[PDB]
């Protein structure tokens, strides 16, 4: 493709791939919160049990 045409197709690929990374990170932050809570419970049980 000629530059001005390629730029359109490339822009779509960059947006899609960057958006995919954003989705991945968001899900990891949410999962991290769940694991942190579990770790805190485990730490409490170690101390009290």
């Amino acid at each position: 493709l000629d530059k001005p045409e390629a730029e359109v197709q490339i822009d779509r690929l960059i947006t899609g791939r960057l958006q995919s990374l954003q989705t991945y990170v968001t899900q990891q932050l949410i999962r991290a919160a769940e694991i942190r809570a579990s770790a805190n419970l485990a730490a409490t049980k170690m101390s009290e049990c």
């Binding site: 000629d2 530059k3 001005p4 045409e5």
Partner: protein, 49 residues
Amino acid sequence: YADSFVIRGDEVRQIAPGQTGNIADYNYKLPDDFTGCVIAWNSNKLDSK
């Protein structure tokens, strides 16, 4: 900056960003991010012999 030259009618399409050809490649090349205006007119009455 005003760049002046004479070419054939069929070569007029080469005076543009992203284009290739024996004018675009060996005589007068514009950058892909070219900013400016291209003006052309038929000079057959003056230049042809």
